[PDB]
């Protein structure tokens, strides 16, 4: 379960404002931007992380329980979730890699064909026979790739199973392949609320560093790869992403409630780019 | 500050099973439909799903203090978004189903959600609000006012006065702002329904105001994960996440939870919007 409950770092306000302008400069200059998300992007919607001060594994180690302020079904996408929806719609996000099983990226309306759910999705069951996935409105009741009790309805009666990897399960080959490709070809990789401790998920951002790519890490705690970052921002990811969206002249869109979008729509208009150097 | 009575902290959470939970939310809809004058009472449990810890919950500020641990914030006050619960309360006021809103919360989210200040009592003050000692004029700021305990903030009044601006955050011994408490008391006494959301009701007189509704036959609903001082006096106790309760209630009422346009201040309630026709109940 790795390093748990490390001390939080807060960039002071003037330093924080400077680093987000610099992140904006990097997004403006970048042809292919990939975002990597972990459990820190859902903590402000009341879903605890794993290795934060009050993380699931941190609390386990200290003989305490983690605290949920919502259910998975009642959770709302954060400001950060909705910013990533908008950044994909205006063509500034190439691909989204997430370790999160909370199902919020999908429920935010983020297009599944630009998303890798490396650790699975609590709302998604998959037919073993035909590999047809089902996005449900409630959490699939099992974890560890177990039978859910439901059968396939494709014109197949296959056994439906959850998509939640147990510790020893290898990552779904499709999601990891597309994730690896997007990471290798990216000229900017931004990590948000991940300590980057899980292989290979935590290593994909490093792939961007090959052939000159830039790496930004946004996290309250240290992460495995702080050493390799061109930019580390120690602040709440909502504060960072809301200030970034402002610099980019983009609004954070309204959440219409739980919606599933399979396929990325054609890109919307975006503001013209600043003169930089 | 040291030995202030922080009441009962870290009580076990209760969860109504799903079938019992759906039945009680329908019954709450039945009470809202039947009621002429509905008053909501909010406390720190309505903000926990936006990453602001409560006081007496399993990971509350006082609960954690008692066990030698620290509460955890997943947001700043400035970056906090109003919850589904916050936004449902905006809508319930706009369509005329909420008469008044009494909050013990200092987190500023009711005001920033766009909820009209003239239908809101902020009994414990507001982190974003400073007040002039000389002319009583209030300023709703975009950042937290840096002091607590009704202290000088360092800024002066700009009214056509130069009065000393002070924070509105009561210390343990400070009496409640007379205007907010007066309006809160009147709204509660005249209510035929008082609904409490995410308060343990342990602070006098704030926690006592919903009981005032019980006088002359009013109904009392308590929505809370933990027990509360006044569970005994409730016509209905719902043990569930207030966002799950309030989203199922809005659905039953035929109302959408509106979009948050970001931090906005509304002084005065606008004229009421249309609302769906009422079901036949009896
Ligand atoms: N609001 C916030 N803003 C910024 N950072 C935050 C915030 N809240 C928390 N953090 C940071 O967010 C970070 C969260 O890191 P970890 O808790 O390891 O979650 P993962 O996604 O990396 O865990 C990967 C897998 O490990 C598990 O076994 C599961 O399989 C997971 O899928 C912390 O450093 C916090 O400081
Ligand atoms: N998502 C949730 N859904 C439902 N209930 C919840 C949730 N989260 C928390 N709760 C419950 O919400 C309740 C919160 O109760 P307390 O923590 O005492 O906060 P107050 O507003 O009453 O504190 C009053 C004053 O006391 C202070 O000194 C300050 O001065 C305050 O202004 C708990 O029972 C939780 O179980
Ligand atoms: N932020 C979060 C998300 C899910 C949970 S959990 O369902 O309670 N357990 C996890 C299931 C997925 C597995 O990868 C790790 C264990 C707890 C916290
Ligand atoms: N949910 C919450 C809100 C504010 C805080 S706080 O600013 O850290 N302190 C409180 C301020 C109000 C006063 O009544 C008691 C102490 C902590 C938790
Ligand atoms: Cl606990
Ligand atoms: Cl894993
Ligand atoms: Zn099948
Ligand atoms: Zn003045």
Swiss-Prot record, chain A:
Its cofactor is Zn(2+). Changing residue 51 to A: Does not affect the mono-ADP-ribosyltransferase activity. Abolished NAD-dependent protein deacetylase and defatty-acylase activities. GO terms for biological process: base-excision repair; cardiac muscle cell differentiation; chromatin remodeling; circadian regulation of gene expression; determination of adult lifespan; DNA repair-dependent chromatin remodeling; double-strand break repair; glucose homeostasis. The keyword Lipid metabolism does not apply. Changing residue 31 to A: In AAA mutant; strongly decreased nucleosome-binding. It comes from the Eukaryota. Changing residue 68 to A/E: Reduced MDL-800 and MDL-801 compounds-binding. Residues 266-275 have a biased composition (Pro residues). It catalyses: N(6)-acetyl-L-lysyl-[protein] + NAD(+) + H2O = 2''-O-acetyl-ADP-D-ribose + nicotinamide + L-lysyl-[protein]; N(6)-tetradecanoyl-L-lysyl-[protein] + NAD(+) + H2O = 2''-O-tetradecanoyl-ADP-D-ribose + nicotinamide + L-lysyl-[protein]; N(6)-hexadecanoyl-L-lysyl-[protein] + NAD(+) + H2O = 2''-O-hexadecanoyl-ADP-D-ribose + nicotinamide + L-lysyl-[protein]; L-lysyl-[protein] + NAD(+) = N(6)-(ADP-D-ribosyl)-L-lysyl-[protein] + nicotinamide + H(+). Changing residue 242 to P: Found in cervical cancer; somatic mutation; reduced histone deacetylase activity; slightly reduced the protein-lysine demyristoylase activity. GO terms for molecular function: chromatin binding; chromatin DNA binding; damaged DNA binding; DNA binding; DNA damage sensor activity; enzyme regulator activity; histone deacetylase activity, NAD-dependent; histone deacetylase regulator activity. Changing residue 102 to N: Found in non-small cell lung cancer; somatic mutation; reduced localization to chromatin; strongly reduced histone deacetylase activity; strongly reduced the protein-lysine demyristoylase activity. Disulfide bonds: none annotated. Acetylated at Lys-19. Deacetylation at Lys-19 by SIRT1 promotes homomultimerization and binding to double-strand breaks (DSBs) sites. Deubiquitinated by USP10, also preventing its degradation by the proteasome. The record marks 4 as: Formation of an covalent adduct with nitro-fatty acid activators. The modification N6-acetyllysine is found at residue 19. Residues 13-251 form the Deacetylase sirtuin-type domain. NAD(+) binds at residues 39, 43, 50-51, 57, 99, 119, 193, 195, 219, 221, 237. NAD-dependent protein deacetylase, deacylase and mono-ADP-ribosyltransferase that plays an essential role in DNA damage repair, telomere maintenance, metabolic homeostasis, inflammation, tumorigenesis and aging. Displays protein-lysine deacetylase or defatty-acylase (demyristoylase and depalmitoylase) activity, depending on the context. Acts as a key histone deacetylase by catalyzing deacetylation of histone H3 at 'Lys-9', 'Lys-18' and 'Lys-56' (H3K9ac, H3K18ac and H3K56ac, respectively), suppressing target gene expression of several transcription factors, including NF-kappa-B. The C-terminal disordered region mediates non-specific DNA-binding. Belongs to the sirtuin family. Class IV subfamily. This is NAD-dependent protein deacylase sirtuin-6. The gene is SIRT6.
């Amino acid at each position: 379960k790795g390093k748990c409950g490390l001390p939080e770092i807060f960039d002071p306000p003037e330093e924080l404002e400077r680093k987000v302008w610099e992140l904006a400069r990097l997004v403006w200059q970048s042809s292919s931007v990939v975002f990597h998300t972990g459990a820190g992007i859902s903590t402000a919607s009341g879903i605890p992380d794993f290795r934060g001060p009050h993380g699931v594994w941190t609390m386990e180690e200290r003989g305490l329980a983690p605290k949920f302020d919502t259910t998975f079904e009642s959770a709302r996408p954060t400001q950060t979730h909705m910013a990533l929806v908008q950044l994909e719609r205006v063509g500034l996000l190439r691909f989204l890699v997430s370790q999160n099983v909370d199902g919020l990226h999908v429920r935010s309306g983020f297009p599944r064909d630009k998303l890798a759910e490396l650790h699975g999705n609590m709302f998604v069951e998959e037919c073993a026979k035909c590999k047809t996935q089902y996005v449900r409105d409630t959490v699939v009741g099992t974890m560890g790739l177990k039978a859910t009790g439901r059968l396939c309805t494709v014109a197949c009666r296959g056994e439906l199973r959850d998509t939640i990897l147990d510790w020893e399960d290898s990552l779904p080959d499709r999601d990891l392949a597309l994730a690896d490709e997007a990471s290798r070809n990216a000229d900017l990789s931004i990590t948000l609320g991940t300590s980057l401790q899980i292989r290979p998920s935590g290593n994909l951002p490093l792939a961007t560093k090959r052939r000159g790519g830039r790496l930004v890490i946004v996290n309250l705690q240290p992460t495995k790869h702080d050493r390799h970052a061109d930019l580390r921002i120690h602040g709440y990811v909502d504060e960072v992403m809301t200030r970034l969206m402002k610099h980019l002249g983009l609004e954070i869109p309204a959440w219409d409630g739980p919606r599933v979008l399979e396929r990325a729509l054609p890109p919307l208009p975006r503001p013209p780019t600043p003169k930089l150097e």
